Design a protein around this ligand. Structure first.
Ligand code: CO0
Ligand code: CO0
Ligand code: BR
Ligand code: BR
Ligand code: BR
Ligand code: BR
Ligand code: NI
Ligand code: NI
Lengths: 287, 287
């Protein structure tokens, strides 16, 4: 059976329950084609200048991504569409509050544009977070997902051009002896569609077989505010931060965070006061 | 049997193994009396002006600490002794690298001075982190400690003035039906001595019974860089940050972090590069 397909607006309340059951769901029209176009246009040059993932120039090289792959993260200062439209997505926030209510506040662990070159091979079948957060491997098998990944198509996803593989139900697997490409189904998607998986869903980028098509995706890893993001917004100019909504500011770590603990004492606080109150951080100040 | 006592220098290699076994150890002369004096002098006025933990002025009130208790965190900008001597402690870093090698890099989840007033009651027997990090309750019972707490005496700890209670072995308890003050032993300490416990050690602040003595402690919660600190250093002036060692900068979250994953892709990175490389962050620049 195939990855369940849900409408971003009509089926909103069904999205997280579907992922909790099956470990995957396709959100049709997660982003409008307008947002997809502006995002592609804004990140285009940064993709072109990005060195290889394991460049000797980098002090945090990525030795896992294929050398032909390009990843651009810290999108807030690059993309108006990302920092305004994506970070304030009603669909994303409903899904995240549904997913993470047991833990408390959530934020962006990483928002990255990934461009896969022609003839890019399939990734090995994997769970995310194993190269950054060893702690998640020590969680009880029954523990609610501490992170989820929105794999948004910025170009068409086909079986030919290397659409994502997922094993439905694999987010509940403890025994991994039945892990095989034979057990996978494909995430066929138009630009603006999003494949939503958990940190436990076994999946992989597909093989590019046309030899001509460049595939591009926006991967948004949303995680509980108790987990450290893969990316930092510390160097993002304060003027850009002060142009955002308070919600967007929290997602970039430019605000204090709260746990779901009845008498929560909070995260990233300053002597009982928030970052935003302390620093007198303004919001929605146009550039 | 009593809390094991170890010399900060002669017994350095024994400190973490002792805590892993017994859930507690007293580090004799963790800080020199010189450092204790300078720390007390530098934080003195900030303790006096600090409102009640649950002050209506605060947007992150602490509803758990007794109203007479005073907690001052984000000590880097207050205290030269803290930011230079404590953050670069050879003993602290050996213990933390011993404790957290399985996870990777560690940093300060919170460094706070706590002053307990005369007639302060004993805290309820508890494990730390339950009002900030619900995630730790979902870790497997056998999981290595993801945070440890250095309870440094800034004044004498006596049975009379409310010295810490610990239950030895309680860090390995799953069944909590034998939890009682009857099962506790006391951390009797001179200023500069430190009681080291894990996030699973069952313990409590003791009752102040003299009715005259003010008790003061420096609580340093050290945790894996994968967990979000209780406190933020985002508002600490860049000049103060650039006066620190690179190690101290990492502990305050003003640097990228690494996991122990063989092909680690890192935490708080910027397109494959560190915070410190990206922002051209200087170190050991005297004010
Ligand atoms: C290494 N790696 C990434 O870089 C990555 C990239 C974008 C978003 C999340 C992310 N995290 C991962 O766990 C990851 C998995 C992965 C596994 C196998 C093959 C290629 C990737
Ligand atoms: C609430 N609370 C704190 O505020 C606190 C203070 C300093 C350092 C860590 C810390 N974290 C806690 O878990 C904590 C425990 C706690 C429990 C029972 C009674 C009083 C405290
Ligand atoms: Br790849
Ligand atoms: Br993919
Ligand atoms: Br208290
Ligand atoms: Br105490
Ligand atoms: Ni993946
Ligand atoms: Ni405690």
């Amino acid at each position: 059976s195939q990855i369940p397909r849900l409408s971003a607006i009509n089926d909103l309340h069904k999205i997280w329950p579907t992922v909790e059951e099956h470990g995957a769901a396709i959100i049709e029209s997660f982003l409008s084609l307008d947002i997809v176009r502006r995002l592609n246009e804004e990140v285009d040059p940064f993709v072109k200048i990005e060195p290889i993932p394991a460049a000797k120039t980098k002090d945090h090289p990525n030795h896992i991504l294929s050398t032909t792959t390009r990843l651009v993260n810290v999108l807030a200062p690059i993309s108006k569409a990302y920092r305004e439209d994506v970070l304030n997505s009603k669909v994303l926030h409903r899904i995240c509050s549904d997913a993470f209510h047991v833990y408390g506040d959530y934020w962006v662990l990483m928002g990255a544009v990934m461009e896969l070159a022609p003839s890019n091979p399939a990734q090995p079948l994997h769970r995310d977070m194993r190269f950054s957060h060893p702690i998640v491997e020590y969680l009880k098998p029954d523990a609610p997902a501490t992170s989820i990944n929105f794999l948004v198509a910025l170009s068409p996803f086909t079986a030919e051009n290397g659409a994502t593989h997922v094993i439905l139900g694999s987010h509940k697997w403890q025994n991994l002896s039945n892990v095989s490409m034979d057990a996978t189904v494909r995430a066929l998607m138009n630009p603006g569609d999003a494949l939503l998986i958990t940190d436990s869903t076994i999946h992989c980028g597909g093989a590019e077989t046309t030899g001509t098509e460049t595939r591009r995706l926006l991967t948004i890893t949303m995680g509980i505010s108790q987990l450290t993001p893969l990316e930092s917004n510390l160097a993002v100019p304060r003027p850009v931060i002060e142009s955002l909504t308070p919600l967007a500011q929290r997602l970039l770590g430019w605000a204090s965070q709260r746990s779901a603990a009845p008498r929560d004492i909070g995260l990233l606080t300053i002597r009982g006061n928030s970052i935003e109150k302390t620093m007198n951080l303004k919001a929605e100040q146009p550039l």
